[PDB]
Amino acid sequence: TKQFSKVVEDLYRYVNAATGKPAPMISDDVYNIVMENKDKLNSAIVYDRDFQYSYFGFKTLERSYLLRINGQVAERPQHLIMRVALGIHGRDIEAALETYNLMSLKYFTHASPTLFNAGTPKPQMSSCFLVAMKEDSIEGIYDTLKECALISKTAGGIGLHIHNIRSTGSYIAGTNGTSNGLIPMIRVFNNTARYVAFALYLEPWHADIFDFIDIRKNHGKEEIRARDLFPALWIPDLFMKRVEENGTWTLFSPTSAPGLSDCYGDEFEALYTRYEKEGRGKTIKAQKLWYSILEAQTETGTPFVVYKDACNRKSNQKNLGVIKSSNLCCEIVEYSAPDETAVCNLASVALPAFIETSEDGKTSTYNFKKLHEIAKVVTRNLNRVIDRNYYPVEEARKSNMRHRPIALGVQGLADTFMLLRLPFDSEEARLLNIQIFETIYHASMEASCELAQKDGPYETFQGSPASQGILQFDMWDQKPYGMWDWDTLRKDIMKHGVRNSLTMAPMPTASTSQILGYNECFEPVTSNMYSFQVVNPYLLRDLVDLGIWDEGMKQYLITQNGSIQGLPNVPQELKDLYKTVWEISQKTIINMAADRSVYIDQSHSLNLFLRAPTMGKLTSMHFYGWKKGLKTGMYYLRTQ
Amino acid sequence: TKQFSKVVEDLYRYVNAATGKPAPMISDDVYNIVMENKDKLNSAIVYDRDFQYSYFGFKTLERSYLLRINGQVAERPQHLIMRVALGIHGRDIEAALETYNLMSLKYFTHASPTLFNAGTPKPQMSSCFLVAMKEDSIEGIYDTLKECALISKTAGGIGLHIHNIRSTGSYIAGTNGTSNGLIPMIRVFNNTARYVAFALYLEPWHADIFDFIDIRKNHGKEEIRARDLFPALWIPDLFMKRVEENGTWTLFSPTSAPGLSDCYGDEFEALYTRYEKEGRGKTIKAQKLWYSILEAQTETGTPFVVYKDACNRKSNQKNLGVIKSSNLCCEIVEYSAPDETAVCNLASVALPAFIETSEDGKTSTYNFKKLHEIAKVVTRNLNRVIDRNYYPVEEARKSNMRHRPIALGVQGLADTFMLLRLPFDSEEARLLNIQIFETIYHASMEASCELAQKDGPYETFQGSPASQGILQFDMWDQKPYGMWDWDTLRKDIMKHGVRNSLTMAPMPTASTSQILGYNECFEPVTSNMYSFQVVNPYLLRDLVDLGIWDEGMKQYLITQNGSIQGLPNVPQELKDLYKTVWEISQKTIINMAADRSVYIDQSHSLNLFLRAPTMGKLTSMHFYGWKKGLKTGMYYLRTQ
Amino acid sequence: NFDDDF
Amino acid sequence: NFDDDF
């Protein structure tokens, strides 16, 4: 009660009245720490920093993040932050004190599940899991389902790959019965989801593919659907080629054509090709599937598209074996197997916090030194999270301890551009994009190398691209932009290793960018009006500064989507600076994505926006991304 | 091909053409036996015995029991029989030869799954399984679900008890979330059923009870239903008392009121009562639940009613612990636990085969000596089945090996009565009912004792009612009817044991009484016309014998349900002999059930038929059964 | 409630 | 099929 240790006492001592069970909401561990250090901890909190969140930003904390006692809010926002700092840092009080300040000052934040659970008795701080279907058998299928149920119990998303499950009509031993396929098994996972979100990963040569991409269709002929599951395609290059050559494409059942999902690139093309020649599947025209994809995406925004070969060929985890899927948001690309469930350890840097208006009037700069610095901090945090996390299933524990993948991201890209008066499609924006990501990658790699010196390289380092001094941009065959000194980094890496197999994967930010008052991660603004009803504060400030914020605006703006193009009284520079995402060529979007990608270890959630969507425009948009070498060609398609 | 060994060669050598996999339809074991004895085996078959099945009887074999090769019938009926004899008897050629003859001569048959699988490589000869829900936890619930899926894979019914799963709103550790209850978990088992029939067992003090009894309701408000699951109530005496005293009844969640389903009778009444006084649940009027039961049964024929206390107090398995459910058809009452899934090993004796028309004209007798004899044979068979069965899950293997329960039954009761010119409600029928069941129980117990001499008592014998010389009718406090010598039997039992913990449980007969041309087990005829369209052959013969089989009959009969009461031209004796089950007082039905029950180890499937059903008539019908001490008060309610 | 005519 | 105006 207005004092951190007292708040901790309360949450710690809490008893569920309606039942008589003591229900501690702090772990023993963090309780004792707060107690053994109450003074330092109590007097470090700056309560002034609570009115630094917007109305609707602070009300997202209150609505859902601040711990509550009897439906009444138990935590002030700084208590939350301080709680998280400790949950992350344990006995490391100086580290915790640093994390507290930087979060409270809004330099970065941590994913929702960290915010919810850090400090509490079963601290599941990890943002999502990637699950391998354990085996094409009732035992295998029910063992997986159990595992998802256990996982889906402490919430957090699941990315499930099912390339190895046989398709409708496939043969089954000891019975006259024929297999029913994927759809009815999807249905089982649907029902388990609803009982306790899901992405499903499939390679497009799977014989149940036509039905699988229609998982989210509206005209639901009862039994063949399955909703709040999201289908994602794990596309090999061969598919895209057949589609552009207008050639054939063969559907197989994994039992007649085994191994397809356990090789990529040329080994996959030989194995695939050899299976076509051997008459093991059913050939159709590549474009019949292509057309069904596009049709499904136009109506439902799914399936997502993640390029299998790009992902595997350019992954520092390639020494592990072949990577069979991404995650629910299409940013994580990490190895998974029957006994290794990959985990997403996520945090995001607040890009705008590094803008500085220096000795002058209107000059702004970007403090890349502070950026590098903070990303070193967040790298250290995400390591602790790996160690201090609660693992809902053993598979997850094995995966994280063994390869230690980390997942850094960003938010307030669009804000940064705007504050610095840079159109999203300016050459300056193009350049800032590159430098921002160069410095984050460089920082996290540097910090991760330091850790390898103290605690050793992750178990699985020897034999990896990084161990051979092949870093991410090398696998893109590009020279780094050169703001940072990569030689020295790479030399140290080869000497000492790094602690983390992977480190970058800019994700969706949803409610954690809301609290901080910034825009969805790295996409631009969808509108200059969200909803109540509030206008883009930068656009707002400029319309006041010109006096034109007369009612011929607040009204206009809402009945125009929040667009400013073709307003009669607004300078062209403002027009260029406040384009809606519907007004930015998806071509620029993809280019900037391709630019930043040589600095992304993993992938990123690349939402795509089309105005007057034709099947042809979509097709060019997929191929464009494809040929740019992107791992994630598309997360959702938003349209109309 | 018209020769048993050649047919075996074929089924044995079969290859799935569409796939190139060798798909043997005989086990190695039975293959080798047929081969090592081809002559004896081949020349024992009497092919004359194929035209002893009716048109629609033989066409049930062909339609679904006779093994097929390429959609074409591979087995003649005698091959089937001979196959089954061997599958049951292995190297015991004399035993097999005896089983062959008696089945071919239609003295008895074995349950469907035996007919399908006996002799084949994974011989799942057992008719159903009773499963314990392993624990009130995600782990527990998903472990069970897996187990049912594995079981439901080789078909055969499941009886699942779920008394221990907490109810809606119940508290859950480490989360703000409250439990959703039974219905959503039922829903998961529904979906698993459909993906790979189910009975669910609940005690009526469970807080989700109102929704649970409505599982099969027609006005389905989407999410709260769940179909092709059958709800069954596991009713304690206390419930019936509260209902008749018009008192209160308390709903508990098993976590606030633990142990209820792990005691019965007075221990349960004290524990229950103590829980009421302690204010652990929510009290309502007994009759509000009662009324909802009756309402549900009137519209859907469910839930079934099986009396928990009758079942436990009068079970030779009471040394095992408390029995928590019956089976899908309400005949089996066997112990189950997280690691013991009880198995139903079923066969039925053909009652009419023992009628003999002796040195005279119109005298018929009943050969009780041959009956005793054949039931000894079937007892021996069902023992072999236990040993030679394929167990789909380890739990089932443990249960069967440990207690060796057997489940003998009957068919052609109604036929026997009719052939012997005995109205179902005659005193002679009442007497034949008793003697028939006395002799079956006596026989199976005798045969089972012999086995205990050769192979030892079942592991779990010491400490059982039987071991103390308490036999089933003793637990009914009645003297046996006295056709057989029970002293000598009981004395031998106490000395040597018996091989089988249990032995009798007259069940539904469905397709295995169809093949043999007889009526549903021990119920009377539902009609004198089934459907095509054929008339009860005994009624038929009599209408010809009187010349009145003029068209003023075949027509009349069908547009009258197949009733003969109030036909103008038919003798009263025929009227009395060919009553429809709608024309027999359910009071007689229940009495005859109570008579035979003192000779039933387990229980029997007591379907109930009401003409002008009122809530009051149902209530009298349940209480009547209840006070008669029945274990199964009702299987389905057929109505209207 | 209790009609004994069944 | 291929409209490059996106």
Side-chain angles (χ1 to χ4, degrees):
Chain A
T1 284
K2 184 76 159 43
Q3 176 143 282
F4 181 68
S5 42
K6 192 42 195 147
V7 173
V8 169
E9 199 50 46
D10 289 349
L11 304 162
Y12 196 60
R13 296 294 170 197
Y14 176 83
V15 172
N16 178 241
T19 212
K21 309 175 184 272
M25 281 159 45
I26 299 300
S27 59
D28 287 347
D29 179 62
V30 168
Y31 182 69
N32 294 326
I33 289 165
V34 188
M35 287 320 130
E36 265 136 60
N37 303 81
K38 59 187 81 160
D39 275 295
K40 185 92 145 308
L41 264 5
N42 282 301
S43 61
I45 288 169
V46 187
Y47 295 99
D48 255 26
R49 288 167 194 181
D50 284 347
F51 14 102
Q52 251 210 7
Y53 301 107
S54 61
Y55 178 65
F56 78 97
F58 158 74
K59 290 276 274 199
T60 323
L61 286 175
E62 204 181 334
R63 172 51 231 197
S64 32
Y65 289 76
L66 305 183
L67 285 165
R68 291 177 186 272
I69 268 147
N70 279 319
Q72 108 93 175
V73 175
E75 260 174 335
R76 268 155 141 296
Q78 314 293 127
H79 307 128
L80 177 327
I81 297 166
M82 179 58 80
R83 175 172 49 79
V84 164
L86 273 351
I88 290 166
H89 292 293
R91 286 297 188 194
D92 198 323
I93 276 67
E94 287 307 311
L97 265 38
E98 165 189 58
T99 284
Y100 163 80
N101 276 306
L102 302 159
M103 286 184 68
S104 33
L105 278 174
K106 324 225 282 80
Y107 284 99
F108 67 91
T109 184
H110 277 259
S112 285
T114 295
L115 303 184
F116 294 143
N117 305 335
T120 77
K122 297 319 180 62
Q124 206 320 98
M125 290 172 293
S126 278
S127 216
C128 59
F129 302 85
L130 322 219
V131 177
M133 168 72 46
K134 287 159 194 307
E135 175 188 81
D136 186 29
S137 68
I138 300 304
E139 291 93 330
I141 296 171
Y142 277 79
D143 277 346
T144 304
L145 178 79
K146 175 188 200 206
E147 182 198 355
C148 295
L150 290 170
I151 287 167
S152 203
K153 157 204 221 181
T154 82
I158 291 181
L160 174 73
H161 69 255
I162 61 175
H163 317 296
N164 50 335
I165 298 309
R166 68 188 78 168
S167 60
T168 318
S170 296
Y171 169 82
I172 310 173
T175 70
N176 27 57
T178 137
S179 176
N180 282 155
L182 287 192
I183 296 307
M185 183 201 93
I186 289 182
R187 214 168 227 270
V188 168
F189 285 81
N190 201 75
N191 145 267
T192 280
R194 307 173 68 89
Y195 169 70
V196 294
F198 255 89
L200 302 170
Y201 275 81
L202 232 207
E203 289 189 28
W205 50 257
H206 197 278
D208 302 316
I209 193 69
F210 280 90
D211 276 347
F212 168 84
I213 63 174
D214 280 357
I215 271 340
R216 290 186 75 93
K217 275 195 168 170
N218 214 219
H219 66 98
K221 277 151 290 67
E222 215 259 39
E223 43 111 86
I224 212 85
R225 287 294 102 88
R227 249 207 262 0
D228 269 358
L229 294 240
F230 296 84
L233 292 169
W234 193 237
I235 300 175
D237 289 340
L238 226 215
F239 183 65
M240 288 309 281
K241 288 188 224 156
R242 296 298 178 71
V243 174
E244 102 185 301
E245 303 165 355
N246 202 4
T248 56
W249 182 251
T250 305
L251 305 182
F252 305 100
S253 162
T255 43
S256 318
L260 265 15
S261 63
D262 242 301
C263 52
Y264 64 105
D266 305 328
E267 203 196 335
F268 163 88
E269 299 209 12
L271 193 56
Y272 194 77
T273 270
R274 183 204 128 202
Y275 285 157
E276 287 189 308
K277 280 143 196 215
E278 288 170 31
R280 278 155 188 255
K282 135 167 215 190
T283 297
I284 217 343
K285 276 280 258 200
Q287 281 189 9
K288 204 192 182 279
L289 225 207
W290 186 252
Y291 192 74
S292 297
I293 316 287
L294 297 205
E295 191 168 329
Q297 301 174 327
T298 301
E299 309 173 15
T300 78
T302 66
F304 312 135
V305 178
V306 189
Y307 300 112
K308 160 185 182 196
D309 297 325
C311 274
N312 270 286
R313 197 190 325 112
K314 296 132 61 159
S315 168
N316 192 47
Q317 292 196 344
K318 68 164 61 156
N319 54 325
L320 305 185
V322 179
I323 296 168
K324 306 182 172 42
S325 82
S326 182
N327 81 292
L328 164 23
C329 294
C330 294
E331 93 263 25
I332 306 298
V333 36
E334 309 181 341
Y335 180 71
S336 56
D339 67 346
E340 287 186 24
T341 287
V343 184
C344 311
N345 317 108
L346 309 163
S348 60
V349 173
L351 299 191
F354 298 104
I355 290 167
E356 285 182 0
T357 308
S358 288
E359 347 167 44
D360 252 12
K362 77 88 165 41
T363 304
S364 283
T365 33
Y366 200 79
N367 189 343
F368 296 96
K369 281 182 210 307
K370 249 302 175 141
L371 178 71
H372 195 261
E373 196 204 292
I374 264 66
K376 295 242 269 172
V377 178
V378 183
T379 304
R380 295 204 257 267
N381 293 13
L382 295 178
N383 273 266
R384 309 279 212 104
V385 171
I386 292 177
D387 287 313
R388 278 163 71 62
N389 191 68
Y390 173 73
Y391 299 94
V393 282
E394 171 56 18
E395 301 99 327
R397 203 222 25 96
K398 194 190 191 177
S399 165
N400 247 12
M401 295 314 300
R402 207 157 136 78
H403 327 289
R404 315 194 102 254
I406 275 329
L408 255 95
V410 303
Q411 54 174 261
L413 221 225
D415 312 63
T416 293
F417 292 157
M418 295 173 175
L419 237 13
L420 290 172
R421 295 246 140 214
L422 313 177
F424 205 97
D425 44 67
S426 67
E427 153 72 28
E428 287 85 20
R430 181 199 134 266
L431 219 223
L432 185 52
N433 188 51
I434 285 164
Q435 37 205 205
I436 284 173
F437 284 85
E438 198 198 351
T439 132
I440 292 163
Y441 181 35
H442 184 270
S444 52
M445 288 292 276
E446 190 175 79
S448 182
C449 189
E450 297 169 346
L451 291 169
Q453 285 162 237
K454 319 193 154 41
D455 318 329
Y458 65 93
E459 325 195 333
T460 211
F461 186 73
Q462 263 199 273
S464 60
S467 79
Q468 311 316 206
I470 302 177
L471 306 191
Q472 173 74 172
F473 50 77
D474 298 306
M475 324 186 95
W476 289 69
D477 308 277
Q478 294 195 22
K479 285 332 175 61
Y481 170 76
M483 170 159 311
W484 301 91
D485 161 8
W486 286 102
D487 284 346
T488 318
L489 192 41
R490 182 194 284 94
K491 149 217 186 45
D492 285 345
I493 293 179
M494 311 186 54
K495 180 88 281 145
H496 305 113
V498 283
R499 193 94 182 98
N500 302 121
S501 66
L502 293 168
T503 67
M504 312 261 283
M507 64 284 159
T509 39
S511 278
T512 67
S513 46
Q514 245 133 244
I515 303 153
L516 309 194
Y518 304 138
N519 196 262
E520 261 300 271
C521 67
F522 53 77
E523 47 190 48
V525 291
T526 59
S527 182
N528 286 313
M529 280 292 320
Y530 287 94
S531 307
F532 248 136
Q533 131 269 11
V534 208
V535 29
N536 170 344
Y538 329 108
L539 173 77
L540 184 43
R541 166 91 299 188
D542 287 335
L543 301 176
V544 162
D545 277 20
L546 277 160
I548 50 169
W549 182 238
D550 44 61
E551 213 18 70
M553 304 240 54
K554 176 220 132 195
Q555 221 261 181
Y556 177 104
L557 224 57
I558 39 178
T559 40
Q560 281 312 311
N561 272 340
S563 170
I564 59 156
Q565 319 306 295
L567 257 158
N569 207 61
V570 177
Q572 181 68 38
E573 77 123 324
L574 285 217
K575 303 259 174 87
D576 295 312
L577 183 72
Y578 296 116
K579 300 196 206 184
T580 262
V581 66
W582 306 99
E583 294 154 355
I584 281 146
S585 182
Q586 290 321 102
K587 205 161 152 166
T588 296
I589 302 306
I590 293 169
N591 284 328
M592 288 176 91
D595 289 337
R596 76 177 67 93
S597 287
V598 303
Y599 301 124
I600 321 286
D601 246 346
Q602 306 213 39
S603 177
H604 60 119
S605 320
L606 196 245
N607 276 147
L608 258 16
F609 304 74
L610 282 189
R611 204 29 172 264
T614 76
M615 260 38 68
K617 266 159 59 169
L618 231 178
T619 292
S620 282
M621 202 181 56
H622 283 316
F623 277 80
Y624 195 58
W626 179 57
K627 280 171 218 288
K628 282 292 206 147
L630 300 181
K631 298 171 181 178
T632 282
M634 182 196 284
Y635 185 39
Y636 290 78
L637 214 220
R638 344 206 156 235
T639 198
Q640 268 151 113
Chain B
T1 284
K2 184 76 159 43
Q3 176 143 282
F4 181 68
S5 42
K6 192 42 195 147
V7 173
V8 169
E9 199 50 46
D10 289 349
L11 304 162
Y12 196 60
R13 296 294 170 197
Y14 176 83
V15 172
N16 178 241
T19 212
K21 309 175 184 272
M25 281 159 45
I26 299 300
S27 59
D28 287 347
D29 179 62
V30 168
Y31 182 69
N32 294 326
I33 289 165
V34 188
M35 287 320 130
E36 265 136 60
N37 303 81
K38 59 187 81 160
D39 275 295
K40 185 92 145 308
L41 264 5
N42 282 301
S43 61
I45 288 169
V46 187
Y47 295 99
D48 255 26
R49 288 167 194 181
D50 284 347
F51 14 102
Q52 251 210 7
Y53 301 107
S54 61
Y55 178 65
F56 78 97
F58 158 74
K59 290 276 274 199
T60 323
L61 286 175
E62 204 181 334
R63 172 51 231 197
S64 32
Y65 289 76
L66 305 183
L67 285 165
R68 291 177 186 272
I69 268 147
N70 279 319
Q72 108 93 175
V73 175
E75 260 174 335
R76 268 155 141 296
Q78 314 293 127
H79 307 128
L80 177 327
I81 297 166
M82 179 58 80
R83 175 172 49 79
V84 164
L86 273 351
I88 290 166
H89 292 293
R91 286 297 188 194
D92 198 323
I93 276 67
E94 287 307 311
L97 265 38
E98 165 189 58
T99 284
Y100 163 80
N101 276 306
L102 302 159
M103 286 184 68
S104 33
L105 278 174
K106 324 225 282 80
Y107 284 99
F108 67 91
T109 184
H110 277 259
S112 285
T114 295
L115 303 184
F116 294 143
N117 305 335
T120 77
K122 297 319 180 62
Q124 206 320 98
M125 290 172 293
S126 278
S127 216
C128 59
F129 302 85
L130 322 219
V131 177
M133 168 72 46
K134 287 159 194 307
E135 175 188 81
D136 186 29
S137 68
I138 300 304
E139 291 93 330
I141 296 171
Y142 277 79
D143 277 346
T144 304
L145 178 79
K146 175 188 200 206
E147 182 198 355
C148 295
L150 290 170
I151 287 167
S152 203
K153 157 204 221 181
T154 82
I158 291 181
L160 174 73
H161 69 255
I162 61 175
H163 317 296
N164 50 335
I165 298 309
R166 68 188 78 168
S167 60
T168 318
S170 296
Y171 169 82
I172 310 173
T175 70
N176 27 57
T178 137
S179 176
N180 282 155
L182 287 192
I183 296 307
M185 183 201 93
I186 289 182
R187 214 168 227 270
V188 168
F189 285 81
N190 201 75
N191 145 267
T192 280
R194 307 173 68 89
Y195 169 70
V196 294
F198 255 89
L200 302 170
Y201 275 81
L202 232 207
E203 289 189 28
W205 50 257
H206 197 278
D208 302 316
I209 193 69
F210 280 90
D211 276 347
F212 168 84
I213 63 174
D214 280 357
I215 271 340
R216 290 186 75 93
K217 275 195 168 170
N218 214 219
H219 66 98
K221 277 151 290 67
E222 215 259 39
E223 43 111 86
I224 212 85
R225 287 294 102 88
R227 249 207 262 0
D228 269 358
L229 294 240
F230 296 84
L233 292 169
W234 193 237
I235 300 175
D237 289 340
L238 226 215
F239 183 65
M240 288 309 281
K241 288 188 224 156
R242 296 298 178 71
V243 174
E244 102 185 301
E245 303 165 355
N246 202 4
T248 56
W249 182 251
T250 305
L251 305 182
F252 305 100
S253 162
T255 43
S256 318
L260 265 15
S261 63
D262 242 301
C263 52
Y264 64 105
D266 305 328
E267 203 196 335
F268 163 88
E269 299 209 12
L271 193 56
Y272 194 77
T273 270
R274 183 204 128 202
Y275 285 157
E276 287 189 308
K277 280 143 196 215
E278 288 170 31
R280 278 155 188 255
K282 135 167 215 190
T283 297
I284 217 343
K285 276 280 258 200
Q287 281 189 9
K288 204 192 182 279
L289 225 207
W290 186 252
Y291 192 74
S292 297
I293 316 287
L294 297 205
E295 191 168 329
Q297 301 174 327
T298 301
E299 309 173 15
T300 78
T302 66
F304 312 135
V305 178
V306 189
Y307 300 112
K308 160 185 182 196
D309 297 325
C311 274
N312 270 286
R313 197 190 325 112
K314 296 132 61 159
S315 168
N316 192 47
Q317 292 196 344
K318 68 164 61 156
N319 54 325
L320 305 185
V322 179
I323 296 168
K324 306 182 172 42
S325 82
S326 182
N327 81 292
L328 164 23
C329 294
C330 294
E331 93 263 25
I332 306 298
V333 36
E334 309 181 341
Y335 180 71
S336 56
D339 67 346
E340 287 186 24
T341 287
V343 184
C344 311
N345 317 108
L346 309 163
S348 60
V349 173
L351 299 191
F354 298 104
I355 290 167
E356 285 182 0
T357 308
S358 288
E359 347 167 44
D360 252 12
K362 77 88 165 41
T363 304
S364 283
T365 33
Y366 200 79
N367 189 343
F368 296 96
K369 281 182 210 307
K370 249 302 175 141
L371 178 71
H372 195 261
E373 196 204 292
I374 264 66
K376 295 242 269 172
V377 178
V378 183
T379 304
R380 295 204 257 267
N381 293 13
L382 295 178
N383 273 266
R384 309 279 212 104
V385 171
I386 292 177
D387 287 313
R388 278 163 71 62
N389 191 68
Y390 173 73
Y391 299 94
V393 282
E394 171 56 18
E395 301 99 327
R397 203 222 25 96
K398 194 190 191 177
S399 165
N400 247 12
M401 295 314 300
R402 207 157 136 78
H403 327 289
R404 315 194 102 254
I406 275 329
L408 255 95
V410 303
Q411 54 174 261
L413 221 225
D415 312 63
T416 293
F417 292 157
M418 295 173 175
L419 237 13
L420 290 172
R421 295 246 140 214
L422 313 177
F424 205 97
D425 44 67
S426 67
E427 153 72 28
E428 287 85 20
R430 181 199 134 266
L431 219 223
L432 185 52
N433 188 51
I434 285 164
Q435 37 205 205
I436 284 173
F437 284 85
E438 198 198 351
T439 132
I440 292 163
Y441 181 35
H442 184 270
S444 52
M445 288 292 276
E446 190 175 79
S448 182
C449 189
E450 297 169 346
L451 291 169
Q453 285 162 237
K454 319 193 154 41
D455 318 329
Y458 65 93
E459 325 195 333
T460 211
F461 186 73
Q462 263 199 273
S464 60
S467 79
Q468 311 316 206
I470 302 177
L471 306 191
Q472 173 74 172
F473 50 77
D474 298 306
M475 324 186 95
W476 289 69
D477 308 277
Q478 294 194 22
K479 285 332 175 61
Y481 170 76
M483 170 159 311
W484 301 91
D485 161 8
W486 286 102
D487 284 346
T488 318
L489 192 41
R490 182 194 284 94
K491 149 217 186 45
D492 285 345
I493 293 179
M494 311 186 54
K495 180 88 281 145
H496 305 113
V498 283
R499 193 94 182 98
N500 302 121
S501 66
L502 293 168
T503 67
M504 312 261 283
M507 64 284 159
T509 39
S511 278
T512 67
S513 46
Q514 245 133 244
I515 303 153
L516 309 194
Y518 304 138
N519 196 262
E520 261 300 271
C521 67
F522 53 77
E523 47 190 48
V525 291
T526 59
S527 182
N528 286 313
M529 280 292 320
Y530 287 94
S531 307
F532 248 136
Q533 131 269 11
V534 208
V535 29
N536 170 344
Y538 329 108
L539 173 77
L540 184 43
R541 166 91 299 188
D542 287 335
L543 301 176
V544 162
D545 277 20
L546 277 160
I548 50 169
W549 182 238
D550 44 61
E551 213 18 70
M553 304 240 54
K554 176 220 132 195
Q555 221 261 181
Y556 177 104
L557 224 57
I558 39 178
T559 40
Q560 281 312 311
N561 272 340
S563 170
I564 59 156
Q565 319 306 295
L567 257 158
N569 207 61
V570 177
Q572 181 68 38
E573 77 123 324
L574 285 217
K575 303 259 174 87
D576 295 312
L577 183 72
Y578 296 116
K579 300 196 206 184
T580 262
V581 66
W582 306 99
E583 294 154 355
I584 281 146
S585 182
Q586 290 321 102
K587 205 161 152 166
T588 296
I589 302 306
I590 293 169
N591 284 328
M592 288 176 91
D595 289 337
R596 76 177 67 93
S597 287
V598 303
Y599 301 124
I600 321 286
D601 246 346
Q602 306 213 39
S603 177
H604 60 119
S605 320
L606 196 245
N607 276 147
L608 258 16
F609 304 74
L610 282 189
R611 204 29 172 264
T614 76
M615 260 38 68
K617 266 159 59 169
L618 231 178
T619 292
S620 282
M621 202 181 56
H622 283 316
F623 277 80
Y624 195 58
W626 179 57
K627 280 171 218 288
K628 282 292 206 147
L630 300 181
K631 298 171 181 178
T632 282
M634 182 196 284
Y635 185 39
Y636 290 78
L637 214 220
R638 344 206 156 235
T639 198
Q640 268 151 113
Chain C
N1 188 268
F2 276 78
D3 186 65
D4 305 342
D5 158 54
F6 62 87
Chain D
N1 188 268
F2 276 78
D3 186 65
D4 305 342
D5 158 54
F6 62 87

